[PDB]
């Protein structure tokens, strides 16, 4: 196996579908473990007169992550929902998890180009229908 | 096969060796045809009092291209030695030849980042020992 651990980064756009079945086949053909990441991305002040729905908001993010994770057969131990700047957190989890190929979509300043610039491992940029 | 035609771009540096055996294995594992490209890169005035060795110069470039092409079993019909700007010519041959994955090394303004920005196909950036 040329690569043993692929991290797929998904932004939950319409575009993801292309990369999902492609990455599923790639991982199989080269014999790599898949992990999955989605980054959650008076501005520090919290509204006092309205009810918050942060738990419903997060659950929606979890369900989209799980739709894809289930399709790819990725154990929930290797699915990542993190908050932060996409480029930073994608590279952080890649390094933390011993990933050797990061897969990102590409249509700035873009996420693909930023991950390329800082990645300590190989990067696959799947050209998306922008 | 997720990809049917991989174009490997080589700059003839010490760094190429990493990408060559990696790309050889990748192409085999995913079942893709390999092509290979190296770009040749009073400034328009030609010296009159010295003998030129442009043919020896080109032959050296051909031998380095052929060392790699022979290793990868690439038919000389699919090896490319072109003059121009690397990013432009790499994308030009990719498009001309119906390539679906371009492989480049990555350590600006870099070639990897430029090919990413203009590529109409997927791009693999192999992280080099800079
Ligand atoms: N919040 C995010 N979580 C995970 N991946 C992302 C995120 N935003 C962007 N990406 C990656 O970057 C690609 C294109 O994003 P962008 O350049 O931000 O439009 C997406 O297909 C993902 O691969
Ligand atoms: N003259 C060239 N011909 C083919 N590929 C090149 C050339 N220059 C740069 N590259 C590609 O870009 C990578 C890094 O180049 P650079 O960013 O120019 O240092 C190399 O490993 C090649 O993949």
Residue numbers in the entry:
A (entry chain A), B (entry chain A): 2 to 42, 51 to 116, 125 to 147
Paper excerpt:
Universal stress proteins (USP) are widely spread proteins in nature. In stress conditions such as heat shock, nutrient starvation, the presence of oxidants, uncouplers, DNA-damaging agents, or other stress agents which may arrest cell growth, USP constitute a natural biological defense mechanism. Under stress, USPs are overproduced and through a variety of mechanisms aid the organism in surviving in such uncomfortable conditions. Here, we present the structures of both apo- and cofactor-bound forms of an euryarchaeal USP AF0826 from A. fulgidus and a bacterial USP NE1028 from N. europaea.
The best-studied USP protein MJ0577-ATP from M. janashii contains a typical ATP-binding motif, which is composed of the following residues: G127-SH-G130-(9X)-G140S141V142 (where the superscripts indicate the position of each residue in the sequence). This motif corresponds to the following residues in NE1028: G114-SH-G117-(8X)-G126S127T128, suggesting that the N. europea USP may be able to bind ATP. Our structure of NE1028–AMP confirms that the protein can bind at least one molecule of ATP analog per monomer. In the NE1028–AMP structure, a conserved stretch of nonpolar residues (as visible on summarizing multiple sequence alignment—Fig. 8), followed by D14 and also strongly conserved S/T residues and V42, form contacts with the adenine ring. The first three residues from the conserved motif (G116-SH-) contacts ribose and the T130 residue binds the phosphates. As a result, we obtained the structure of AF0826 with dAMP bound in the vicinity of the ATP-binding motif. All of the residues binding dAMP in AF0826 are analogs of the residues binding AMP in the NE1028 structure, and interact with the ligand in very similar ways, as shown in Fig. 4B and D. Where hydroxyl groups are interacting with G and A (AF0826: G103, A9; NE1028: G114, A10) and adenine ring is positioned by either V or S (S40 and V40, respectively).
